[PDB]
Amino acid sequence: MFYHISLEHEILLHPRYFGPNLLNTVKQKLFTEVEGTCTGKYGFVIAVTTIDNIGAGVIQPGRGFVLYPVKYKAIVFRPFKGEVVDAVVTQVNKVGLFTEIGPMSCFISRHSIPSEMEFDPNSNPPCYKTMDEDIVIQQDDEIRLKIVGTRVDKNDIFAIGSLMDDYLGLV
Amino acid sequence: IIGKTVTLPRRYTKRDCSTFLRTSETGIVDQVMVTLNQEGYKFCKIRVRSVR
Amino acid sequence: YRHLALLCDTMTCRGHLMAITRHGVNRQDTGPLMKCSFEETVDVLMEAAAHGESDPMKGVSENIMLGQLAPAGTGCFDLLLDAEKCKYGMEIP
Amino acid sequence: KHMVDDKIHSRARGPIQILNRQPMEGRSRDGGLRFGEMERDCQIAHGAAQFLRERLFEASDPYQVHVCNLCGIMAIANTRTHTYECRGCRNKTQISLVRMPYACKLLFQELMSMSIAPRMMSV
Amino acid sequence: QPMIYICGECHTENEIKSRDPIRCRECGYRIMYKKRTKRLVVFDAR
Amino acid sequence: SACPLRTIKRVQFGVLSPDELKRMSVTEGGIKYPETTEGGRPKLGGLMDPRQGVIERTGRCQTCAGNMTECPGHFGHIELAKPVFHVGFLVKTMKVLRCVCFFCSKLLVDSNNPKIKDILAKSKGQPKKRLTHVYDLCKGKNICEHGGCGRYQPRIRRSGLELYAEWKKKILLSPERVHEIFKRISDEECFVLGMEPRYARPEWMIVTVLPVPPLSVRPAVVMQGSARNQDDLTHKLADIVKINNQLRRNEQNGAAAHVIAEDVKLLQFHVATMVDNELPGLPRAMQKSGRPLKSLKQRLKGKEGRVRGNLMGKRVDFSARTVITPDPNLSIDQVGVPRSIAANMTFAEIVTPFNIDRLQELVRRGNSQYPGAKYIIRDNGDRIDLRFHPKPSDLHLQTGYKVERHMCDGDIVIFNRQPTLHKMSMMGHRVRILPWSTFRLNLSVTTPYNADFDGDEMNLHLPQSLETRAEIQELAMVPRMIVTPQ
Amino acid sequence: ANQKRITTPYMTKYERARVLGTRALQIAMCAPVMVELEGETDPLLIAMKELKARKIPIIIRRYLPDGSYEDWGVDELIISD
Amino acid sequence: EEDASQLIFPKEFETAETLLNSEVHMLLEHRKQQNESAEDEQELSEVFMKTLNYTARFSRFKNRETIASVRSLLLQKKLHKFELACLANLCPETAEESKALIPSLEGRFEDEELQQILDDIQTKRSFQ
Amino acid sequence: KSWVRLKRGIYKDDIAQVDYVEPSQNTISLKMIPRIDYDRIKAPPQRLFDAEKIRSLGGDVASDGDFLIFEGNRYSRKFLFKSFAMSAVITEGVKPTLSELEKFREHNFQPGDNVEVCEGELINLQGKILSVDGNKITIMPKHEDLKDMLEFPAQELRKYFKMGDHVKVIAGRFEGDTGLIVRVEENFVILFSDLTMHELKVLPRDLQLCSETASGVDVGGQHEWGELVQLDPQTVGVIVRLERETFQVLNMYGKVVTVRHQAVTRKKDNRFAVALDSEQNNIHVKDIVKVIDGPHSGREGEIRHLFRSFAFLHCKKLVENGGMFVCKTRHLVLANELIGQTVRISQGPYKGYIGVVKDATESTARVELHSTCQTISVDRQRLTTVGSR
RNA sequence: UAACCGGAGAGGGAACCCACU
Ligand SMILES: [Mg+2]
Ligand SMILES: [Zn+2]
Ligand SMILES: [Zn+2]
Ligand SMILES: [Zn+2]
Ligand SMILES: [Zn+2]
Q: Pick out residues 20-59 of chain D having their CB under 7 A from any atom of nucleic acid strand J.
A: 24, 29
Nucleotide nearest to F385 (CA to C1'): J8
Which residue of A lies nearest to I162 if distances are taken between CA atoms?
A148
CATH of the domain at G12: 3.90.940.10
Residue F139 CA to ligand 5 centre (angstroms)? 14
* Beta carbons of C89 and A20 less than 8 Å apart: yes
Phi, psi torsion values for I354, nearest 5 degrees: -120, 130
Q: Could you tell me if A125 and A99 lie in one domain?
A: yes
A99 forms beta bridges with A89, A106
Q: In this structure, are A74 and A124 located in the same domain?
A: no
Which numbered ligand comes closest to the C-alpha of D80? 4
> Which residues span the domain enclosing A85?
81-171
Q: Which chain A residue is nearest to residue F469, measuring alpha carbons?
A: A62
Q: Answer whether F244's CB lies under 8 Å from F58's CB.
A: no
Q: Give residues 42 to 81 of C whose Cβ lies within 8 Å of A.
A: 69, 75, 78-81
CA I164 to ligand 4 centroid distance, Å? 30
Nearest alpha-carbon partner for H23 in A170, G38, A4? A4
F290 strand J contact, CB < 7 Å: no
Burial C40-50 (b: 16+ CB within 10 A, else e): bbbbbbbbbbb
State how far the Cα of D61 lies from the Cα of D103, in Å rounded to an integer: 8
* Alpha-carbon span C11 to C5, nearest angstrom: 10
Q: Considering its fold, how many domains does chain A have in total?
A: 2
F292: three-class secondary structure by DSSP: coil
- Check if I369 contacts B (Cβ < 8 Å): no
Nearest chain A alpha carbon to F468 = A62
Q: How many domains does chain G have?
A: 1
Parallel, antiparallel, or unpaired for β G58-63 and C78-81?
Answer: antiparallel
Domains and CATH numbers, chain H: 1-126 (1.20.1250.40)
Range of the domain at G17: 1-81
Q: In what order do the strands lie in the sheet with E13-16?
A: B42-49, B28-36, E32-34, E3-6, E13-16
Task: Point out the residue among F2, F4, F467 whose CB comes nearest to the CB of A62.
Answer: F467
Given a contact cutoff of 8 angstroms between Cβ atoms, the answer to whether I17 and I1 are in contact is yes
B27 reaches I (C-beta below 8 A)? yes
Dist. CA F53 → ligand 4 center (Å): 4
CB A69 within 8 A of CB A78: no
Is I268 labelled a binding residue? yes
Burial of A160 (0-12, 13-18, 19+ CB in 10 A): buried
Chain F hits for B17, CB-CB cut-off 8 Å, are 224
I368 at interface of B, judged by CB pairs closer than 8 A:
yes
| Chain J bases near protein CB atoms (7 A cut-off) | 3-5, 7-15, 20-21
Reported for I194-202, long-range contacts at CB under 8 A and 24+ positions apart, including other chains, are I194/A151, I194/A153, I194/I166, I195/I225, I196/I225, I196/I240, I196/I241, I196/I242, I196/I322, I197/A107, I197/I319, I197/I322, I198/I241, I199/A109, I200/I169, I200/I174, I202/I169, I202/I172, I202/I174
Q: Which residue is nearest to nucleotide J10 (CA to C1')?
A: D15
Find chain B residues with C-beta within 8 A of E32's C-beta. Answer: 33-35
Helix axes C42-51, F127-138, angle to 10 degrees: 80
Q: Are F272 and F282 in contact (CB under 8 A)?
A: yes
Are D44 and C60 an interchain contact pair (Cβ–Cβ within 8 Å)?
A: yes
The CATH T-level fold of domain E3-46 is Rubrerythrin, domain 2 (2.20.28)
Are F313 and F360 in contact, with CB atoms under 8 Å apart?
no
F109 φψ region: left (φ > 0), alpha (ψ -120 to 50), beta (else):
alpha
Q: Enumerate the residues of chain F whose CB falls inside 8 A of the CB of residue C29.
A: 126
Helix axes F127-138, F114-122, angle to 10 degrees: 160
For A48, the enclosing helix (H) or strand (E) is strand A43-54
Same domain for A74 and A116, yes or no, is no
Please give the single-letter amino acid code of residue I85. A
Whether any strand J atom is under 7 angstroms from the Cβ of I308: the reply reads yes
- Which candidate, I123, I120, I155, places its Cα nearest to that of I139? I155
Residue I344: phi and psi, rounded to 5, are -125, 130
D104 labelled binding-site residue: no
Residues 6+ apart with CB under 8 A from F261: none
Has I5 been labeled as part of a binding site?
no
> For chain E, which residues make up each domain, given as ranges?
3-46
Pair F28, F22: CB distance under 8 Å: no
Q: Which chains touch C (3 or more CB pairs under 8 A)?
A: A, D, F, G
Looking at the structure, tell me whether residues A41 and A109 fall in a common domain.
no
CA closest to C1' of J4 belongs to I308
CATH of the domain at A124: 2.40.50.140
Residues A122 and A161 both lie in one domain: yes
Which of residues 431 to 470 on F have a Cβ less than 7 angstroms from any strand J atom? 454-456
Chain breaks in chain C (C to N over 2.5 A) after: none
Q: Are residues A12 and A53 in the same domain?
A: yes
* Interchain contact, F350 vs G13, CB within 8 Å: no
Q: Which ligand is nearest to the CA of E12?
A: 3
User: What distance in Å separates residue I385's CA from the closest CA in chain E?
Assistant: 13
Distance CA I254, CA I258 (A): 13
Q: Are F271 and F78 in contact (CB under 8 A)?
A: no
Tell me the CA–centroid distance for residue I213 and ligand 4, in Å.
15
Closest-CA residue of chain G to C79: G60
Same domain assignment for residues A67 and A98: no
How many Cβ atoms are within 10 Å of I105's Cβ, its own excluded?
6
Question: How many Cβ atoms sit within 10 Å of the Cβ of residue G33?
Answer: 19
* Buried-exposed string I260-274: b where 16+ CB fall within 10 A, e elsewhere: ebeebebeeeeeeee
Resolution value, angstrom units? 4.6
The kind and range of the H/E element at F189 are: helix F187-193
Which residue type occupies F478? V
* 3-state per-residue secondary structure call for chain G: CCCCCCCCCEECHHHHHHHHHHHHHHHHCCCCCCCCCCCCCCHHHHHHHHHHHCCCCEEEEEECCCCCEEEEECCCCEECC
Strand partners of residue I282: I276
Cis geometry, peptide bond prior to residue F419 (ω within 30 degrees of 0): yes
I67 C-beta neighbours (distance < 10 Å), count: 13
- What is d(CA I218, CA F62) in angstroms, rounded to the nearest whole number? 8
- Residue A71: give its domain's CATH number: 3.30.1490.120
Measured CA F321 to C1' J13 distance, in angstroms: 26
Q: Positive or negative, the Cα torsion across H48, H51, H56, H60? A: negative
| D53, D83, D93 ranked by CB distance to A41: nearest | D93
Q: Which ligand is nearest to the CA of F100?
A: 5
User: DSSP of C37-67, one letter per residue?
Assistant: HSS--HHHHHHHHHHT-EE---SSHHHHHTT
